Every structure is written in structure tokens, then in C-alpha cells.
Design a protein around this ligand. Structure first.
Ligand SMILES: Cc1cc2c(s1)N=C1N(c3ccc(N4CCOCC4)cc3)CC[C@@]1(O)C2=O
Ligand SMILES: Nc1ncnc2c1ncn2[C@@H]1O[C@H](COP(=O)(O)OP(=O)(O)O)[C@@H](O)[C@H]1O
Ligand code: VO4
Ligand SMILES: [Mg+2]
Lengths: 767, 155
């Protein structure tokens, strides 16, 4: 139906293959016994034509003309040409690794990046902008059922919205993936979808909230040029009818360490480079800075420029987002000024006094700029750093500080200002998004920092990778546990199956009492504790006692076998990273600042990791009370190359995500379920005579009678207590029959109209 | 094909159909143009689509419809074939088809919504034909009781 796809416009060839290609696939010959996939050393799996089968081995000729021989256990059956580039992989005759691999590969080769996998969706990063996110495409997806339109992030969004109204339930859209997979892009598309359907309106403000927070919380990393260094859960609130009422953003821990530290091949937060890009020369003047990042110690330890990023154009986007969000002129200045002060703090120099270990300023020029930007007296700032108060009501009793203690405190203060400003911006955005409209339900979109492996992995990477493990286990519990219980709850005949998808071994190791975080938190409460005493406790009760806790063989201190791979961690400074101490004397000066924003930033757990675990636990608890929709992002290659796909990398991701296992439960189970009242209402059209008006049959009985009267395989559905459950594809068939029946009834109604008019005209001729 | 149609209409019915068919003769040659065939099949009680009418005539081009003529003897088996091809559409089937455009709860679709459907979907009807069907159908505010509309066209 190339006419039906014309509503998508220029996006049509990128969402669904042509009607000509579909007809060619239907008429392409195929010998089932000779068309096979064969395991390959170089490519993992290759398509091949069997030449000979003998003595338990198969000799086949590949597409590339090469002759290959394998045992019969390494030969997989190929699906026929009608299943080429299939939109739902749960519909393939044969489901195995090469089939899923090659379906994703072939769809990706036509630039079709979305593909259904039973109850969830998979997306492979194109590394290029495709015209599939136009306003015309948003329009085309509105109201469409999952079967009525090509796979897309907009369809997942719309479907979640439909479930929200029909079940009167909160929904959540959970987007999976390792660093650089496409979680942030897909999160922004979900936001775009719901928003589309001077200070801006709620719709403009929801859209603009991301570019602002990305300037301050995203940074270039080895795996991603725009890496999210904070997690977010955006709730989009809707009223009883389904009108977009409000929105809110919740952010989790920001990676504060990045403000003052960078590895060789990474940058700090985008904002520093955006400011110094000189697109707005007035900002350079206002902040008392230069356009050379190398002049700032805290933000020039790694890279400075990123070929894919135009820091000038991005500064315009950040400034424009501040305008749409409605920050006052004073608030906007304070945001930039505090950022400038953070840069200056890093350049402050200190030296020991003669015959002492006590610190004293090594010049005051830098301190003068930072204090100007913070509306503080620079002499008070320097005295508070070198001589902090012991007691609250006494300014005479002070403790000394060495040069290293002052530098450390300066780092901690710069991070606290930055982090608190980041949290204040979120608070401000939320005040703008709170329309005070009545709200009944919401759809939450989760965008966490993805699984990452660097050359050096610290406490930040452990928390990020643990968050990913907890989220993979949430998918596992939903797909392989709650789904089976859902069948039993509805009275459907079902014998439990153990899918063996359970990450409890690694999760227990990290979060159980006496686990890694428990040992770290325990060592934080001993002032005599060192990195080595922490390393020793970890080894004493986890090495050789847990299979997921290993020593690195070929530097790192321990290795954890995560769901997505083995990661080598280094425990240097973990005790210092887990405590959040500030110089309270300097905090007192910030509270008294004439800069109202800074004074506001400084006006409950014992460690940072305990707060982290609670944020994580609260999120998982909240997600339990929603109907989740999973989007699994996949990177095709590790070089950001558009269109190129490394087979083993994709297979690795499919495996640890449990994609094939998830497709298997959708094939064995009933992935589609409709409430009887909603079924009767939608599909009576198929055979209205089966449910005549004169009978007062209830919704459930009418559905039974209707399904039993149409040409459908009667084994593809089962009756639950409140819903009819369907095997994969039956809803697509019912939807296809509905579309056909509605088209016929319109022409038949027109034929009646034509008949009516011809008979009234004939009546006039008779008289 | 037409030769293979067995005529089932009674002698009385055939004579009445001939009298009705001849009211459409505009030139005195006892023939009608193919373009009038649809109107005569409909006048006699059938409800064929323009596709079914074209099919009985042996799928003639748009020019052949206006230029070629037909005698009652050749039209008669065509009427029989259309009558045998029992135009299946029940009253409830039509209200379910129109119920799709409800938008609201009550059994009433909007005025211009029904006009758009009849004039742009399926076998597109002329604007003037759709206006004739709306013979005092739109209530105040501009809405039509689709259940009542189906009874009206089926009357
Ligand atoms: C539901 C949550 C999501 C989520 C969480 S929580 N946590 C995060 N990130 C983080 C965690 C801990 C630390 N710390 C812990 C203390 O020692 C230093 C590193 C720093 C950043 C950085 C990315 C992140 O926001 C995220 O994606
Ligand atoms: N749908 C997409 N279309 C085009 N490029 C994309 C898409 N999703 C991701 N990318 C590319 O990948 C980059 C990183 O995506 P992103 O979502 O930020 O990864 P992460 O999941 O780490 O947030 C994008 O900046 C862009 O270059
Ligand atoms: O670069 V990520 O959004 O996977 O942290
Ligand atoms: Mg991101």
C-alpha cells in the first residue's frame, strides 16, 4: 500500500519498504532445505547454499562464493523471503541468533533503525540524521495501534499513552543501552512526540529543558561525544481526558568529579567550552576569563575540542533554552558568573608559610576574580580557606590547614557550587513546568547514564554499571517473571518456565549488607581507614567466595563480571569520594553573598553511595507501580560510523540484553491482551450479525461469539477473567480484517446512497 | 458470460423492468447509453457499486460508457447477474461503519465529517450528490444521527 504510506511524506522509505519490494519478496523462489546460516570464524554467521550433506557434516557455498564445511549443529534454518526486513521478529518462523542478527542488519542497511521484538522494541544507532522525526511523522503516528504502523519511537510513545487511558494506569518508557547507544536521543524524541501533540509555553519548555541540562551535565567521553553524566526521569502528566497537563524532571547524582578532573581522552561539561567559544564575547568580558581553555586547570586535563561539536552554535542553543525557560536577567547572569567562578577556583595558588606546614596564598589575583564573580570579599574567602572555624558561635578558635588540605577544600567547594546550581536549575525548570492543572496519570521516560568501560574505572563507573545491572534485572523480572504470573492471574492455562535470566548474583555482591557498598560505607566511618584497608576487607570476604568478584590477571584492584562484561575497577580515593565534607567557614560566606542565587544554593545519609542506593531503590520502587515499555538501544560499531555493523558487537548486546529470550517468551506466551468491553467495541465491525443489538449479551460473551464466528485460527487466543489474550500476530490479522471491512462498508454505504438517489429520481420520472 | 446467465425474473417482472428501462431512453431507439445502466439497475431495486456496474458491462473505458448503447434484451441478464450478486450490507453493518466516526459518545457524527467520508473515501461521490443525501439531516449545531441517516438511505 504505497498510497497508505504517503501520509509519512519523505520519511516513508525510511519506515517501510516499497510495495514493489514486498511483491518481489513474495515471488522470490526459496529452497528451504538448502538455504541456511552457517557459523563463521570471521563474521560469526553467514548465509550459504548447501552443496552436500554427508557423514554428519554440511558443505555450503556462501554469498561471497567461499566453500565452508561445518557439523550439522552449526547450520541454522533460514526464513523465507516474505520474512525479509520483518517489523516484528516474534513473527519469524525460525528464531535464532543469525535470524535476529541478519534481520536487524538488513533493516539497518535500508536505514530502518526501529524493529519490534514481541513486547519490546530494538533500535540500532544510525550515527546520521534521518528524516523520520518531522512534524508530519508525529501527525501520522497519532492514534495508530502498534500493528497499524511501522516500528518507531513515536509508536511506542503513542501506545504507552493509549494504555494509560484504557487501563487508567501510569506508564514508563525505559530506554536501555551502553554508553553512546542512543538513550538520550530516543528520550528527546519521546518528549518531542508528547509536546508536539521570549518565555515559551509548556510544550516549548519541556523541549528546551534538555539542551540546558545537557550543557551542564553532558560531557565528551571516549565512548560518546555527548555522554549523559546524570540520570533523569521525566514525568509527563495528563488529565482525566488525556490532555497534557504538566511535567517534571527528576535528576539523580551528577558526576561532580568531572568538574575538577578529566582523563586524557575526555572533556569536562560542555558549558565551559561553549562559554570560551567566544560566540558571545560579552560572556568572556562578564566572567573575566580568556577564550583559551588551557588557561583553566580544572577543565583542561584531557581534550578541549570535539570535531562533531560546534561549541559556538551549542552556546546559542543553551542561551536560547534559558530564555524559553523564563529565567530572570539576574538568574541568567548568576548562572554564567558562577560557572566562571568555578573555572577561576582551579587557578588559585597556595604555598606553605616559612618554617610551617600552614598554607597561605601564593598571590591573590585569581582569588580576586572568583570573589568578584561570587560577590564575596576576596580576603575573607582566602582567610576562611586557610583558617576555618572550630565552633559555630566563635570566630577566634580556628584550625590550621596544610596546602594540600586547602587545594582539596577548593576542589570540593567548586564541585558543590556547580552541583547545587545544577540541582537549582532543575528546581527552576520544574516550577515553570508545574502549570497547577489537575492531573490524573503520567508517562515517565527514563534516561540513565549507560554501561561504560574505560581504561580507568572508578567509583563513578561502578555506580553507573550497577544502575544498568539493576535496570537489566527490572527487564528480566517484568519479561520472565511478572509476565508468567499475569497469565496465571487471568486464569489462562500456563505451566511455568524457568528462563534463567537472573542477575541476582552480581546485584547481591554489590548491594546486600556485607557487599561492596556495605564494606565501603563501613570503612568511611573510621578515620584511620586507608585505600589498602578497604581493598583488604573486600578481598577477605568476597575473593573466592563470590564468582562475580575476581582479581584482574594482567593498574586495577578488582574485577566484577557485570551482565554486559567484566570490568576492572580501581579503588584509589573511594573513601574520599564517598564523603561530602565542605569548609563550613566558606559556606558561611556564600550564605551572606549579595548574589541572591549563590546565597540560595547554600541556605541526610552518612555517605554519598548510601544516597545513590536510596535514589536507585526509590526509582525501582516507583517503576514497579507503572506499566513499563522497553526500548533496547544497540550500537552497531565502536567508531560512530554510519551504516557499518560489527557482527560480534551486536550479538554481544543482543545476548546480555536478553533480546532472544524476550522474543521466546512473547512467542510462547500471549503478548497482546484486550479488555472485553474494548474488544467488543473495536471488532464488532468484523461480523455485526454475530452480536445482534436485540440480544443483551455481556462484553465477554459477545467477544467469544465474535471470535468464534470469524475466519481466525481458534487456538491463537485464550479467554482470561477480564481480558482476551492473543498469540503474536493475531491482533495484526484482526486489525487487517478491520481495515478491509471498514473500507467495504464505506463503499457499500455509498452504493446505498447511489441507489437511494437513483430511486428518488426514478420516482420523479414516474410522476 | 452474459449468455450463461439464466433468467429468474417472472414474466410480469420482466415486462415491468422493460417499461422502466424505456423511461431512460432519450433518443427513441429503445436503447440507453452504458452511462445510464447504473441508474436503471438502481431504479429497479439493486445497489451495485460503480465497480460492479463496470464489471457487468465487461469493464468498458470511460469513453465507451458515454458512446456505446444497450438494448433491454442485453441489459436483462446484467440485471440478473447484479441481483444474484446479492449486495451484502445489513442495516447494523452500516451503523457500525459510521459508528467509527463518533468522536463523542452519543449516537451522532458531525455534519462535515460524514460529508468528507462520502465525498473522499471509497467510491468518491459527487459534492451535489452528497448534498442531496443531506435532505434535512443536519440538526442544529451541525450534527447527524447516523442511525437515522442509514434508515433514510435504506428507505
Ligand atoms: C537511579 C539513578 C540513575 C543514575 C544514578 S542513580 N547515579 C548516577 N551517577 C552517579 C552515581 C554515583 C556517583 N558517586 C557516588 C559516590 O562516589 C562518587 C560517585 C556519582 C554519579 C552518574 C549517572 C547517574 O546520575 C545515573 O544515571
Ligand atoms: N536516532 C538517532 N539518529 C541519529 N543519530 C543518533 C540517533 N541516536 C543516537 N545517535 C547518535 O549517537 C549519539 C549519541 O546518542 P545518545 O543517545 O546521546 O547516546 P546515549 O545513549 O549515550 O545518550 C548522538 O549524539 C548521535 O550522534
Ligand atoms: O553516554 V551515556 O547517556 O550511555 O552515559
Ligand atoms: Mg545520554
Amino acid at each position: 500500500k504505497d498510497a497508505d504510506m504517503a501520509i509519512f511524506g519523505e520519511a516513508a522509505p525510511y519506515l517501510r519498504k516499497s510495495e514493489k519490494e514486498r511483491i518481489e519478496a513474495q515471488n522470490k523462489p526459496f529452497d528451504a532445505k538448502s538455504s541456511v546460516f552457517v557459523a563463521d570464524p570471521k563474521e560469526s554467521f553467514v548465509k550459504a547454499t548447501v552443496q552436500s550433506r554427508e557423514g554428519g557434516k554440511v558443505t555450503a557455498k556462501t554469498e561471497a562464493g567461499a566453500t565452508v564445511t561445518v557439523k550439522e549443529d552449526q547450520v541454522f534454518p533460514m526464513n523465507p523471503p516474505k520474512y525479509d526486513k520483518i517489523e516484528d521478529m516474534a513473527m519469524m518462523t525460525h528464531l535464532h541468533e543469525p535470524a535476529v542478527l541478519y534481520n536487524l542488519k538488513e533493516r539497518y542497511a535500508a536505514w530502518m533503525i526501529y524493529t519490534y521484538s514481541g513486547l519490546f522494541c530494538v533500535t540500532v544507532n544510525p550515527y546520521k540524521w534521518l528524516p523520520v522525526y518531522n512534524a508530519e511523522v508525529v501527525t501520522a503516528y497519532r492514534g495508530k495501534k502498534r500493528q497499524e504502523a511501522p516500528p518507531h519511537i513515536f509508536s511506542i510513545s503513542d501506545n504507552a499513552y493509549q494504555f494509560m487511558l484504557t487501563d487508567r494506569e501510569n506508564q514508563s518508557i525505559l530506554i536501555t543501552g551502553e554508553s553512546g547507544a542512543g538513550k538520550t536521543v530516543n528520550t528527546k524524541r519521546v518528549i518531542q512526540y508528547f509536546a508536539t501533540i521570549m518565555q515559551g509555553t509548556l510544550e516549548d519548555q519541556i523541549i528546551s529543558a534538555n539542551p540546558l541540562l545537557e550543557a551542564f551535565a553532558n560531557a565528551k567521553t571516549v565512548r560518546n561525544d555527548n555522554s549523559s553524566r546524570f540520570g533523569k526521569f521525566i514525568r509527563i502528566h495528563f488529565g482525566t481526558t488525556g490532555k497534557l497537563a504538566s511535567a517534571d524532571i527528576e535528576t539523580y547524582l551528577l558526576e561532580k568529579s568531572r568538574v575538577t578532573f578529566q582523563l586524557k581522552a575526555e572533556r569536562s561539561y560542555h558549558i565551559f567550552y561553549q562559554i570560551m567559544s567566544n560566540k558571545k564575547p560579552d560572556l568572556i568580558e562578564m566572567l573575566l576569563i580568556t577564550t583559551n581553555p588551557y588557561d583553566y586547570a580544572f577543565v583542561s586535563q584531557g581534550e578541549i575540542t570535539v570535531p562533531s561539536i560546534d561549541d559556538q552554535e551549542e552556546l546559542m542553543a543553551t542561551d536560547s533554552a534559558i530564555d524559553i525557560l523564563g529565567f530572570t536577567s539576574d538568574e541568567r547572569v548568576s548562572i554564567y558568573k558562577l560557572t566562571g567562578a568555578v573555572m577561576h577556583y582551579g587557578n588559585m595558588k597556595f604555598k606553605q608559610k616559612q618554617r610551617e606546614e600552614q598554607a597561605e596564598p601564593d598571590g591573590t589575583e585569581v582569588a580576586d576574580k572568583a570573589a568578584y564573580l561570587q560577590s564575596l570579599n576576596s580576603x575573607d574567602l582566602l582567610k576562611a580557606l586557610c583558617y576555618p572555624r572550630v565552633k559555630v558561635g566563635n570566630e577566634y578558635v580556628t584550625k590550621g590547614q596544610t596546602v594540600q588540605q586547602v587545594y582539596n577544600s577548593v576542589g570540593a567547594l567548586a564541585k558543590a557550587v556547580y552541583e547545587k546550581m545544577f540541582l537549582w536549575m532543575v528546581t527552576r525548570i520544574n516550577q515553570q513546568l508545574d502549570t497547577k492543572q489537575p492531573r490524573q496519570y503520567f508517562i515517565g521516560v527514563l534516561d540513565i547514564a549507560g554501561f561504560e568501560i574505560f581504561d580507568f574505572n572508578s567509583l563513578e563507573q561502578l555506580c553507573i554499571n550497577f544502575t544498568n545491572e539493576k535496570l537489566q534485572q527490572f527487564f528480566n523480572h517484568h519479561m520472565f517473571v511478572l509476565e508468567q504470573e499475569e497469565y496465571k492471574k487471568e486464569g489462562i492455562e500456563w505451566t511455568f518456565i524457568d528462563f534463567g535470566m537472573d542477575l541476582a548474583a552480581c546485584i547481591e555482591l554489590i548491594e546486600k549488607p556485607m557487599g561492596i557498598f556495605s564494606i565501603l560505607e563501613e570503612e568511611c566511618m573510621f578515620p584511620k581507614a586507608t585505600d589498602t584497608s578497604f581493598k583488604n576487607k573486600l578481598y577477605e570476604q568476597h575473593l573466592g567466595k563470590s564468582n562475580n568478584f575476581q582479581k584482574p590477571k594482567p593498574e586495577a584492584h578488582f574485577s566484577l563480571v557485570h551482565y554486559a562484561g567484566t570490568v576492572d575497577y580501581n579503588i584509589t580515593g573511594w573513601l574520599d569520594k564517598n564523603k561530602d565534607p565542605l569548609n563550613e567557614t566558606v559556606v558561611g560566606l556564600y550564605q551572606k553573598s549579595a548574589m541572591k542565587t549563590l546565597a540560595f544554593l547554600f541556605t541526610s545519609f552518612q555517605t554519598v553511595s548510601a544516597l545513590f542506593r536510596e535514589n536507585l531503590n526509590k526509582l525501582m520502587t516507583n517503576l514497579r507501580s507503572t506499566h513499563p515499555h522497553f526500548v533496547r538501544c544497540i550500537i552497531p560499531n565502536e567508531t560512530k560510523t554510519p551504516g557499518a555493523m560489527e557482527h560480534e558487537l551486536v550479538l554481544h548486546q543482543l545476548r546480555c540484553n536478553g533480546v532472544l529470550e524476550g522474543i521466546r517468551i512473547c512467542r510462547k506466551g500471549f503478548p497482546s491482551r484486550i479488555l472485553y468491553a474494548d474488544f467488543k467495541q473495536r471488532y464488532k465491525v468484523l461480523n455485526a450479525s454475530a452480536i445482534p443489538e436485540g440480544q443483551f449479551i455481556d462484553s465477554k460473551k459477545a467477544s467469544e461469539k465474535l471470535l468464534g464466528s470469524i475466519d481466525v485460527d481458534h487456538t491463537q487466543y485464550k479467554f482470561g477473567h477480564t481480558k482476551v489474550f492473543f498469540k503474536a500476530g493475531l491482533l495484526g490479522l484482526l486489525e487487517e480484517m478491520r481495515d478491509d471491512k471498514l473500507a467495504q462498508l464505506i463503499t457499500r454505504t455509498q452504493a446505498m446512497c447511489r441507489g437511494f438517489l437513483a430511486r428518488v429520481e426514478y420516482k420523479k420520472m414516474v410522476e | 458470460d452474459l449468455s450463461a446467465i439464466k433468467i429468474e425474473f417472472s414474466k410480469e417482472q420482466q415486462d415491468e423492468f422493460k417499461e422502466a428501462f424505456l423511461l431512460y431512453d432519450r433518443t427513441g431507439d429503445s436503447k440507453i447509453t452504458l452511462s445510464q445502466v447504473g441508474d436503471v439497475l438502481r431504479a429497479l431495486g439493486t445497489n451495485p457499486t460503480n465497480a460492479e456496474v463496470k464489471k457487468v458491462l465487461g469493464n468498458p473505458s470511460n469513453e465507451e460508457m458515454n458512446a456505446k448503447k444497450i438494448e433491454f434484451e442485453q441489459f436483462l441478464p446484467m440485471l440478473q447477474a447484479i441481483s444474484n450478486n446479492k449486495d451484502q450490507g445489513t442495516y447494523e453493518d452500516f451503523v457500525e461503519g459510521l459508528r467509527v466516526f463518533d468522536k463523542e459518545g452519543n449516537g451522532t457524527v458531525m455534519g462535515a465529517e460524514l460529508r468528507h467520508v462520502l465525498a473522499t473515501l471509497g467510491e468518491k461521490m459527487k459534492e451535489e450528490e452528497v448534498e442531496a443525501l443531506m435532505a434535512g439531516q443536519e440538526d442544529s449545531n451541525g450534527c447527524i444521527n447516523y442511525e437515522a441517516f442509514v434508515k433514510h438511505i435504506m428507505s
